[PDB]
Amino acid sequence: HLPLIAITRNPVFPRFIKIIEVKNKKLVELLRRKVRLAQPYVGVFLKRDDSNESDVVESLDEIYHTGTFAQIHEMQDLGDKLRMIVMGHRRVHISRQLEMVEVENVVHEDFQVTEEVKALTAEIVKTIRDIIALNPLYRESVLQMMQAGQRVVDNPIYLSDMGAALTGAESHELQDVLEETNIPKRLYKALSLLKKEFELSKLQQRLGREVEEKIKQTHRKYLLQEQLKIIK
Amino acid sequence: IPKRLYKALSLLKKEFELSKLQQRLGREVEEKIKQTHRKYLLQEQLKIIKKELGLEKDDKDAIEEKFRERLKELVVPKHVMDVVDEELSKLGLLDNHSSEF
Amino acid sequence: IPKRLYKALSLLKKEFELSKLQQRLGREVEEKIKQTHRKYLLQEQLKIIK
């Protein structure tokens, strides 16, 4: 029941530490007004097409109905005066933000047989492992800490979200995956997103080795011609 | 001995069958994503051409862009236009600092 | 004895600054060469894709 925040280009994927550094100075007044609460919290939302900070403060329809309530970690202000840390813990999809009413409709229906439902997880983690091996993005200690063989994945949906967060697809695609209600449908799209990044990555590696090997085919023949010259 | 041998083989068969049906569904997903047009892949490379450097300064592209938006305004003919286009190709061949540049 | 230690140490620091200056100068010139050829890789990638 707080006025909307100026997210200012900061996606907070579920189970993914993130930082928010809004440029406006009117939000610092609200951040200083909420230190009195015993259980403080802050929400994180996603922006609609054609981002505009003036529309966030002018109108309240721009922000998506989805929200991510969470608890604060610690304020710092090392360099800037507005450096808050954010995380994605409590997802919400407001029925009507304009008319804030909210409800934790965090559906996670699953069929009784949960045996063949983890076969897709194996493909998601092997494809993500191949994305970080052929296209290394993040550290590999996090993958060894949270393994699928440890039985510590109390929220498979959250771990799948953690895996789908590695994709660089525009925010809209993430919103589209969030709109999906069935679990295999969003997982199928997440796998598709993973391959979608994979195509670009494989293209980039082929292009890099191609240009580099072309440079070598240049200079190696120059080494041969240089040998020719010196013998001449 | 024959029971353990067949059950072990069966375990390999069924686990491979799960991996095979899932891998086939994934190959089909790969086919449906590969349906994405080749323009998207070449467009990714097109963005890579413009996103290797940070700024537009200290380059022949800068001058090429001011003169080329010019070219777009003043309605050049097909001859002089193509002649300056091929000459601009040479200017691309020409060095950033050469005295002839 | 502490004065000779002071003067000898002063000589050590005097050499240490000049030496560090020479290495900094060398790495700077070399990094200019690296940024040259690396930007050549970027412009070459631009060429090949174009």
Curated annotation (Swiss-Prot), chain A:
Residues 2-198 form the Lon N-terminal domain. One of its GO terms (cellular component) is membrane. Its main location: mitochondrion. GO terms for molecular function: ADP binding; ATP binding; ATP hydrolysis activity; ATP-dependent peptidase activity; DNA polymerase binding; G-quadruplex DNA binding; identical protein binding; insulin receptor substrate binding. Duodenum, heart, lung and liver, but not thymus. One of its GO terms (biological process) is negative regulation of insulin receptor signaling pathway. It comes from the Eukaryota. Keywords: ATP-binding, Cataract, Deafness, Disease variant, DNA-binding, Dwarfism, Hydrolase, Mitochondrion, Nucleotide-binding, Protease, Serine protease, Transit peptide. It is found in: Mitochondrion matrix. The Lon N-terminal domains are crucial for the overall structure of the protein, maintaining it in a conformation allowing its proper functioning. The AP-domain (ATP-binding and proteolytic domains) has a closed-ring conformation in the presence of AMP-PNP and its N-terminal entry gate appears closed. Upon ADP binding, it switches to a lock-washer conformation and its N-terminal gate opens. ATP-dependent serine protease that mediates the selective degradation of misfolded, unassembled or oxidatively damaged polypeptides as well as certain short-lived regulatory proteins in the mitochondrial matrix. Endogenous substrates include mitochondrial steroidogenic acute regulatory (StAR) protein, DELE1, helicase Twinkle (TWNK) and the large ribosomal subunit protein MRPL32/bL32m. MRPL32/bL32m is protected from degradation by LONP1 when it is bound to a nucleic acid (RNA), but TWNK is not. May also have a chaperone function in the assembly of inner membrane protein complexes. Homohexamer. Organized in a ring with a central cavity. The ATP-binding and proteolytic domains (AP-domain) form a hexameric chamber, while the N-terminal domain is arranged as a trimer of dimers. DNA and RNA binding is stimulated by substrate and inhibited by ATP binding. Interacts with TWNK and mitochondrial DNA polymerase subunit POLG. Belongs to the peptidase S16 family. It is linked to CODAS syndrome: A rare syndrome characterized by the combination of cerebral, ocular, dental, auricular, and skeletal features. These include developmental delay, craniofacial anomalies, cataracts, ptosis, median nasal groove, delayed tooth eruption, hearing loss, short stature, delayed epiphyseal ossification, metaphyseal hip dysplasia, and vertebral coronal clefts. This is Lon protease homolog, mitochondrial. It comes from Homo sapiens (Human). The lineage of its organism: Eukaryota, Metazoa, Chordata, Craniata, Vertebrata. The gene is LONP1. The chain holds residues 123 to 404 of 959 of the full protein.
